[PDB]
C-alpha cells in the first residue's frame, strides 16, 4: 500500500506475504526531475 505520494519521491509498503524477517517495509522510489537528455530534451516523472 502506498504510504505517501509526493512530486519528489514516492514510498510504498511491503505486504506481509512477500517480506523478509527484519526490515520488512523498505521502498524508496526517488523520481527524477527535469534533467538534460542526450538530445537537449526534457525528461521528468510524474506520480500517477
Amino acid at each position: 500500500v502506498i504510504d505517501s505520494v509526493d512530486a519528489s519521491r514516492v514510498v510504498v509498503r511491503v505486504a506481509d506475504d512477500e517480506v523478509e524477517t527484519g526490515e520488512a517495509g523498505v521502498d524508496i522510489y526517488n523520481l527524477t526531475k527535469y534533467t538534460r537528455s542526450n538530445q537537449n530534451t526534457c525528461i521528468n516523472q510524474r506520480p500517477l
Partner: protein, 225 residues
C-alpha cells in the same frame, strides 16, 4: 425596413444559452448570423490570471515539497479559472492552505468586486508534510497575448521571484446559428436567427450581443464619414 426589437434570451444552462433576436428580412438573416459569429470569437472582454508569484520556488520548472502535482501542472490549471471583474481592472488575489486537503477555486479569499464562477475546479493536491502560498494577479484584456509580447512592468530585479503565465482568455467557445421561419402576418419572406452561444460564464449572454453591436457599428461608420 424591419429592425430587431426586444430580443429573447433563452437560458437553458449556465454555460450554453440560446438567443432568438427577431424575424428579419430574407437575405439579411444569414448575413447577420455569420457576421455576429466572427465578432464573438475575435474580440470580447475577458479576465484571466496574468502572473503568479510564489514565495517558495524560484522558477516554474522545479517542483516543491508537499504538493503532489508539479508546479507546471499548477500553472496550467490557473488558465481554466473564470474570474469576473465588475469595477476594478487589475486586482491582486492571494491563496494559502496548510494541511492534508485539496485546494480548489473557492480557497481564494473573497472580495467585494471579485466573483469566481466555478468552485469545483481543482488546482493541486496537498499533504501533511507540505503547504503552499502564492499571490495571484489578474487583468482585463481583449484577445490572446503571449508572455513574450506584453513585456511591461519590469525592473530587471523580479526575474527569480515573479513568474509570468500565458494569457489565453476567451469567454466565448462555441457559436452556432441557424435560419428558422416565423410568421408576422405582414410578408412572406421572414426568417429569424437562433444563436447557440456557449459562454464559460464570465459574461452574460444578454450583454454579449450588445457588446457585439457597438463594435460592428463603429466599423461601418467609416463608410459614412
Amino acid at each position: 425596413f424591419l429592425t430587431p426589437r426586444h430580443i429573447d434570451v433563452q437560458v437553458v444552462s449556465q454555460t450554453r444559452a440560446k438567443i432568438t433576436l427577431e424575424p428579419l428580412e430574407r437575405g439579411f438573416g444569414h448575413t447577420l448570423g455569420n457576421a455576429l459569429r466572427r465578432i464573438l470569437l475575435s474580440s470580447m472582454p475577458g479576465c484571466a490570471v496574468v502572473e503568479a508569484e510564489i514565495d517558495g520556488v524560484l522558477h516554474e520548472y522545479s517542483a516543491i515539497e508537499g504538493v503532489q502535482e508539479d508546479v507546471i501542472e499548477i500553472l496550467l490549471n490557473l488558465k481554466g479559472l473564470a474570474i469576473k471583474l465588475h469595477g476594478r481592472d487589475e486586482v491582486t488575489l492571494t491563496l494559502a492552505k496548510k494541511g492534508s486537503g485539496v485546494v480548489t477555486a473557492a480557497d481564494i479569499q473573497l472580495d467585494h468586486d471579485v466573483e469566481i464562477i466555478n468552485g469545483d475546479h481543482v488546482i493541486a493536491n496537498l499533504a501533511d508534510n507540505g503547504a503552499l502560498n502564492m499571490k495571484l494577479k489578474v487583468a482585463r484584456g481583449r484577445g490572446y497575448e503571449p508572455a513574450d509580447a506584453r513585456q511591461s512592468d519590469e525592473d530587471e530585479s523580479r526575474s527569480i521571484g515573479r513568474l509570468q503565465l500565458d494569457a489565453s482568455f476567451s469567454p466565448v467557445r462555441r457559436v452556432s446559428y441557424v435560419v428558422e421561419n416565423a410568421r408576422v402576418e405582414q410578408r412572406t419572406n421572414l426568417d429569424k436567427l437562433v444563436l447557440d452561444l456557449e459562454t464559460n460564464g464570465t459574461l452574460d449572454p444578454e450583454e454579449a450581443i450588445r457588446r457585439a453591436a457597438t463594435i460592428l457599428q463603429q466599423q461601418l461608420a467609416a463608410f459614412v464619414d
